[PDB]
Design a protein around this nucleic acid. Structure first.
Ligand SMILES: [Zn+2]
Lengths: 361, 239, 576
DNA sequence: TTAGGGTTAG
């Protein structure tokens, strides 16, 4: 089934992949697990990971780290791994002052009522937010959150029962994929015929692989030894370009490979992904994406309102941001990395672009 | 502006070391026009009364096309760079001086300078200007210092008109009067006209002035700026 | 029709009262023959417009009178002419030429100034209330007949013999408000019937053309003894087919970055009015040309068009020279603007503005009692459908986690933080030591089919945390001690992130509270899409995200997460 | 007559 066999890795173009879905319990088993990667499942093409289900508990197995609650909802049944949580750092009960007493008391109210929502007995109605897992060949739910449904009457159950078909027909039954499918389709894949083009593709794959491995810093030789990156780099194009030294094909080609690796990391510097800290080394690089440190610093310098001006500034200007950063840390901070971090921050909701060139946090 | 199209009639030609050059002769006449394509041909002249012709206006259009695509800059104050030059254009809010080879001109664009502008230690009594249209918007105003030959020009000016400061110098500041750090922007105009340092009064019929007006229409209604005129009992509209 | 302002006034012993007719629903009054008469009206509305200009310091004082500074009060009426009765005062008691013309459009009434009359007395005009109209004659001029008007003179062969600008100033302004576009009017002129009476005015004995109308060879300035009349004969109805025609636009002509509404106009349905304070906070009075500040005004027309499933909201501004507004601009009214000026801000918001080119007209008065249409109930994924999608809605979603949360006590005089009145600007920009509570919060919500981040402002937070107002006020009493409280949480189920500190017992309390299921409940949210539908925000390709959880890291294409602004938080059926 | 295009150091 091609239409069912949606693009590889099941990208989140279809929104549901990021939000707790609402399927019949009985259907939760009929879905496939993805053969491409474990820990993700499929229904009518739409990929699912986070699931929402509400029913009644019918059986218990209690363990030291988790409970295991069997749960039913009419159409079917499953069991649910409900990780426990302890009360480490115990809050005492003391005759504190008015404010402290009130804080402690309200905290205790919240805590005790949370317990009452958490504790459970067979036949009760239970809600669970979590994801699909499988073990011993059996499929189950590992809940992110679970709480007792405090309804005195079946009205809300009735609502859900009436609803689920509606949401099915509206959203989940829709299989179609509206993506344009703008695939390169392996044009010059085995050979770029152009050392700059090879370097661009090399930088692509290398930044991909670094973000995958989450490596924050790296000596360039460490990267130059990667199997996939090497394979990509050593395609016949570089061997033919460096072939002028016929008597040293191996040596000249390996040197050209090291040079084109240097060129790729330099392209990353130009595009602000990676940068060479003032470490005194010649081929050591720090990746901006993982540079939580600079993220924190540049977030300090505005999250706390801009410290230099007395006036009630709403944030700071691109140039003054850059200048105060270079002042407080290092003049050598390239604008490329600054732009990259400013992008990532608003992606994270750590900064907002009220306009271009001026920002707040 | 560069790119204007000029017509000179009874222009007398002279020579200097084989370098030919024209001069405003006895019996001289002239016309001049706007350089933009997609806009009318409006005459700009001070000579006798004239008759335009289709050949004449087509020379203007052809020179427009030529400059535009056979021979082949705009900058808000908020887009400047720390030390450089530019042909800025603004309105004069006030003029002042302290005894010396320099003269002050205070202007505004309606956009925020990245760093705050340099602020002079002026003898305030010498400054001509109205505080009403300034104080509670001072963050959108700047200062410029002209020198030598530009002094007598600036001195002779009148507040309220529109200017274009050709080759205005920008320069970075980083200190306060008591030598505490503060990042700031300076503006200057060096003596002598070399490279084209100068000022020309702009007519309020110029389409650039229409563009600057257009800009401020947003800078006030859609200002999004905090409160001012907290003394809300002051206006009384048409009292 | 009064001489000073044109505005149709009702006058009778003891004084006068302005009024606002309408021939019939959605059609304007159109024949001058109706001046002078008696109108008996009994199904009518009486309006007011309180223009108070108080100066309250804080909300507290609203309980008292001792802070109002001034008062005025417009007052007037409005009614159809299907309800009132017209009575023609029987004429109390004990040689011309005419021509027909269709009219194209109207310049607005303004105190223009004027040229030297073309080739005539070169006295320099002063400003004076004036306007002019564009049209085109039909048939040649016609002589005095008694039975109306004689046979047309041989109609002119050229367009200049028909197309005509109609200029008005002085007493004849009294003929303004009857004029409406597209119709065929009839002008009449007494006196010795003679050629040339209307046919030219490019260079003439006298005609003080306005600057914008200089050089036009088809002008015509009417004489006080001339006046207009409406044409309605069925023998000319085939010309009056302009019926069911209006100056209107396509919404893609709008909502796009090019020309400045000299091209376009649009029906509308107002929703509010208040003063343009940020202009007085940047007082510049048309670059210093207007003089004293007749404060500027803003409206929020809910644009209308048959083209679209939803009306994009689209503010309109009114600046000093066009104050006071026309009559009949009120919440609920149905209004049909014409030839505004459109300006898109650098901060990128489409907004429209008044100029002499633009003139109001009303199509219907408010409804008796305000209706209540409930905002649609939808699923968040519809806002990712790719096509057009509703503008504002409610959705039965579920809090999943709290991102950011800040509280502030701020001075009501200046836009800064303020600990209980001891303002940082105290004594400088801020005279008075007084402060008020202010709070901000960002949620993450889901609904069974999409992700979305909701930012929520002001008191609402008390409903986001689900706190009863009383206890929330108690808490705020506490936070008043530090004056500013900021928390940032590394994420769902995680500890407070680096941007905030954990030591305060109150901090732990809050943190727990932001992590309790009792917060992370279901709620019915209603909201407004944070970025309105338009071209103004460019599109972008998808970003690349690399998860890290469960079994292995997932790398994927993802769109940028929604951002939505809060409007209503309400629980449903107490779902735990 | 002068000036007869090209960077100040303020
Ligand atoms: Zn204050």
């Amino acid at each position: 089934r091609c239409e069912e066999e949606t693009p590889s890795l099941l990208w989140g173009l279809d929104p549901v992949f990021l939000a707790f879905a609402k399927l019949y319990i009985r259907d939760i088993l009929d879905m496939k697990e993805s053969r491409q990667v474990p820990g993700v499942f499929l229904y009518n093409g739409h990929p699912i990971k986070q699931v929402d289900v509400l029913g009644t508990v019918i059986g218990v197995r209690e363990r030291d780290a988790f409970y295991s609650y069997g749960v039913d909802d009419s159409t079917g049944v499953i069991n649910c791994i409900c990780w426990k949580k302890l009360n480490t750092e115990s809050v005492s009960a003391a005759p504190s002052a008015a404010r402290e007493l009130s804080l402690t008391s309200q905290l205790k109210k919240l805590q005790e009522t949370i317990e009452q929502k958490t504790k459970i007995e067979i036949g009760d109605t239970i809600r669970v937010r979590g994801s699909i897992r499988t073990y011993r060949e059996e499929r189950e739910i590992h809940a992110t959150t679970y709480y007792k449904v405090d309804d005195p009457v079946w009205n809300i159950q009735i609502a859900r029962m009436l609803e689920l078909p509606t949401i099915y027909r509206k959203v989940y039954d829709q299989p179609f994929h509206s993506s344009a499918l703008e695939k390169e389709e392996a044009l010059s894949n085995p050979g770029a015929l152009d050392l700059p083009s090879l370097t661009s593709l090399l930088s692509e794959k290398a930044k991909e692989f670094l973000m995958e491995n989450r490596v924050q810093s790296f000596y360039q030789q460490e990267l130059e030894m990667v199997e996939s990156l090497l394979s990509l780099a050593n395609q016949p194009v570089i061997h033919s370009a460096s072939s002028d030294q016929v008597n040293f094909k191996k040596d000249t080609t390996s040197k050209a490979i090291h040079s084109i690796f240097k060129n790729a990391i330099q392209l990353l510097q130009e595009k602000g992904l990676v940068f060479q800290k003032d470490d005194g080394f010649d081929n050591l690089y720090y990746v901006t994406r993982e540079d939580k440190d600079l993220h924190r610093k540049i977030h300090r310098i505005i999250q706390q309102d801009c410290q230099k001006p007395n006036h009630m500034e709403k944030g700071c200007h691109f140039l003054h941001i850059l200048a105060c950063a270079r002042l407080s840390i290092r003049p050598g901070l390239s604008e490329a990395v600054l732009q990259q971090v400013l992008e990532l921050l608003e992606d994270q909701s750590d900064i907002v672009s009220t306009m271009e060139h001026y920002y707040t946090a | 502006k560069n790119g204007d199209i000029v017509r000179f009639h009874r222009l007398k030609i002279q020579v200097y070391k084989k370098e030919t050059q024209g001069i405003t002769s006895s019996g001289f006449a002239s016309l001049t026009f706007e350089g933009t394509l997609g806009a009318p041909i409006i005459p700009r002249t001070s000579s006798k009364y004239f008759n335009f012709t289709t050949e004449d206006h087509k020379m203007v259009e052809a020179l427009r096309v030529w400059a535009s695509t056979h021979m082949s800059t705009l900058l808000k104050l908020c887009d400047v760079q720390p030390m450089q030059y530019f042909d800025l254009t603004c309105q004069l809010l006030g003029k002042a001086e302290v005894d010396g080879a320099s003269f002050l001109l205070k202007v505004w664009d309606g956009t925020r300078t990245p760093f705050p502008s340099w602020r002079v230690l002026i003898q305030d009594l010498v400054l001509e200007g109205d505080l009403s249209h300034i104080h509670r918007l001072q963050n959108l105003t700047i200062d410029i210092l002209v020198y030598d030959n530009h002094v007598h020009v600036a001195r002779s000016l009148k507040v309220g008109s529109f200017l274009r400061i050709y080759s205005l110098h920008t320069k970075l500041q980083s200190m306060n009067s008591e030598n505490q750090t503060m990042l700031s922007l300076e503006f200057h105009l060096h003596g002598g006209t070399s490279y084209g340092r100068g000022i020309r009064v702009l007519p309020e019929s110029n389409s650039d002035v229409d563009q600057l007006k257009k800009d401020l229409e947003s800078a006030n209604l859609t200002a999004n700026q905090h409160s001012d005129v907290i003394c809300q009992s002051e206006p009384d509209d048409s009292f | 029709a009064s001489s000073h302002k044109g505005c149709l006034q009702l006058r009778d012993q003891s004084g006068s009262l302005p009024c606002l007719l309408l021939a019939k629903h959605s059609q304007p009054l159109s024949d001058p023959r109706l001046i002078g008469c008696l109108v008996r009206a009994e199904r009518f509305q009486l309006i007011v417009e309180r223009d108070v200009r108080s100066s309250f310091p804080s909300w507290k004082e609203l309980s008292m009178p001792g802070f109002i500074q001034k008062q005025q009060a417009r007052v007037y009426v409005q009614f159809f002419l299907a309800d009132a009765l017209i009575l023609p005062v029987p004429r109390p008691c004990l040689l011309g030429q005419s021509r027909l013309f269709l009219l194209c459009h109207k310049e607005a009434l303004m105190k223009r100034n004027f040229c030297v009359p073309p080739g005539a007395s070169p006295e320099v005009p002063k400003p004076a209330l004036s306007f002019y109209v564009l049209g085109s004659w039909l048939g040649g001029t016609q002589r005095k007949e008694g039975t109306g008007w004689g046979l047309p003179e041989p109609q002119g062969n050229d367009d200049n013999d028909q197309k005509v600008h109609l200029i008005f100033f002085g007493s004849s302004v009294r003929w303004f408000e009857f004029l409406h576009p597209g119709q065929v009017y009839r002008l009449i002129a007494p006196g010795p019937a003679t050629p040339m009476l209307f046919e030219k005015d490019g260079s003439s004995c006298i005609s003080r053309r306005p600057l914008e109308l200089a050089g036009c060879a088809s002008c015509l300035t009417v004489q006080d003894n001339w006046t207009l009349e409406l044409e309605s004969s069925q023998d000319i109805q085939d010309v009056l087919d302009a019926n069911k025609s209006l100056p209107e636009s396509s919404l893609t002509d709008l909502l796009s970055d090019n020309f400045t509404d000299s091209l376009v106009s649009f029906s509308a349905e107002i929703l509010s009015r208040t003063l343009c304070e940020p202009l007085v906070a940047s007082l510049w009075m048309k670059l210093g040309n207007t003089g004293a500040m007749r404060r500027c005004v803003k409206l929020t027309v809910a644009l209308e068009t048959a083209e679209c499933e939803f009306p994009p909201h689209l503010d309109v501004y009114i600046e000093d020279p066009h104050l006071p507004p026309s009559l009949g601009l009120l919440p609920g009214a149905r209004v049909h603007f014409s030839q505004l000026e459109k300006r898109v801000s650098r901060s990128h918001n489409v907004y429209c503005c008044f100029r002499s080119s633009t003139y109001v007209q009303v199509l219907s008065f408010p409804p008796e009692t305000t209706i209540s249409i409930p905002l649609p109930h939808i699923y968040l994924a519809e806002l990712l459908q790719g096509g057009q999608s509703p503008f504002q809605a409610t959705a039965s979603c579920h809090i999943v986690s709290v991102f950011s949360l800040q509280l502030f006590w701020v001075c009501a005089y200046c836009t800064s933080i303020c600990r209980q009145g001891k303002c940082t600007r105290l004594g400088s920009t801020c005279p008075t030591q007084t402060a008020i509570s202010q709070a901000i919060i960002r949620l993450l919500v889901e609904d069974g089919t999409a992700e979305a981040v909701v930012t929520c402002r002001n008191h609402h937070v008390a409903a986001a945390l689900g706190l009863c107002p009383r206890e929330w006020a108690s808490l705020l009493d506490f936070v008043q001690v530090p004056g500013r409280v900021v928390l940032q949480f590394a994420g769902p189920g995680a500890q407070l992130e680096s941007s905030a500190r954990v030591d305060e017992p109150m901090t732990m309390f809050l943190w727990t509270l932001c992590t309790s299921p009792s917060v992370l409940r279901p709620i019915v949210l209603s909201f407004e899409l944070e970025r309105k539908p338009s071209k103004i925000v460019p599109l972008e390709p998808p970003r690349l995200q690399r998860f890290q959880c469960g079994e292995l890291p997932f790398l994927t294409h993802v769109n940028p997460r929604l951002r939505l602004s809060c409007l209503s938080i309400r629980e449903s059926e107490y779902s735990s």
